């Protein structure tokens, strides 16, 4: 920018999107990466492999196309994350993918975080991933219990219209249950 001698960062570092030091460490395993990403409203989970002209996504799942299976609740929460992980994990299996390492990009490795939930899901789908159990949420929070109880302190529906007033961690089970057998795109 200033002169001929000036050093301009790699595009993905300018954009503050890729941590290249972490990426190299990730690629060292030589295994596929389980890309765990979030959005204010959604949660995405992809299984990426290395390619000649860039990464190749062999299997993915988005919290949105979750409804396509009966999801009638918000999609920017714990139960959502897990299921998207499991969903991507299954498509992954179908694609012939057996193992992967957890790439959480620029997110923070906070215990019980959604990325780890995504990881839990992908693992239960059948994918072998290096992990650590006591950094994950305690199942109940994954089901969405922390939210149901939060609505117990009601007085006003946590959900604007949406579905239910007291919410449903049961709706969570029904869905996980569904994903664990048959159905299209899995």
């Amino acid at each position: 920018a200033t002169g001929p001698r000036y050093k301009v960062p790699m595009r993905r570092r300018r954009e503050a999107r890729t941590d290249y030091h972490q990426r190299l460490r990730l690629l060292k395993s030589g295994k596929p990466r389980l890309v765990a990403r979030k959005s204010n409203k959604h949660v995405r989970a992809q299984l990426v492999t290395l390619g000649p002209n860039g990464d190749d996504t062999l299997a993915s799942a988005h919290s949105s196309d979750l409804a396509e299976y009966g999801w009638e609740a918000p999609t920017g929460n714990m139960p959502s994350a897990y299921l998207t992980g499991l969903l991507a994990g299954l498509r992954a299996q179908e694609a012939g993918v057996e193992e992967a390492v957890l790439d959480i990009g620029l997110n923070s490795p906070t215990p019980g975080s959604k990325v780890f939930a995504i990881q839990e899901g992908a693992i239960d789908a059948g994918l072998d991933i290096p992990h650590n159990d006591d950094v994950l949420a305690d199942w109940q929070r994954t089901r969405g219990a922390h939210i149901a109880e939060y609505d117990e302190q009601l007085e006003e529906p946590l959900y604007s219209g949406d579905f239910d007033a007291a919410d449903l961690p049961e709706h969570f089970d029904e869905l996980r249950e569904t994903l664990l057998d048959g159905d299209i795109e899995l």
């Binding site: 000036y6 050093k7 301009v8 960062p9 790699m10 290249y20 030091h21 990426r23 190299l24 030589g30």
Partner: protein
């Protein structure tokens, strides 16, 4: 030479042009090569590990197995045969 350390007279070859300064792309540090493949040896100023003696900069060897993640490349020094331990970071496919 006034000294005979490995880096004697390497000011140039082990220095980046100002613009190629800074951590290098990981793609090439992970490249995978097969036994028999020809590869050009060239140290990357930005990558500290997986290096070989500066004297071999410019050589074009033959990949013949690996050791750990590092590769074992066979080259011929003058008339002597030699085996070099080097990582992908410092290798390129010929042609």
């Amino acid at each position: 030479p006034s000294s005979n350390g490995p880096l004697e007279g390497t000011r140039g070859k082990l220095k980046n042009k100002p613009r190629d300064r800074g951590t290098s792309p990981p793609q090439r540090a992970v490249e995978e090569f097969d036994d028999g493949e020809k590869v050009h040896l060239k140290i990357d100023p930005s990558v500290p590990n997986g290096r070989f003696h500066p004297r071999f900069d410019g050589q074009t060897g033959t990949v013949e197995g690996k050791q750990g993640d590092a590769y074992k490349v066979d080259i011929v020094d003058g008339g002597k045969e030699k085996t070099i331990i080097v990582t992908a970071a410092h290798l390129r496919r010929q042609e």
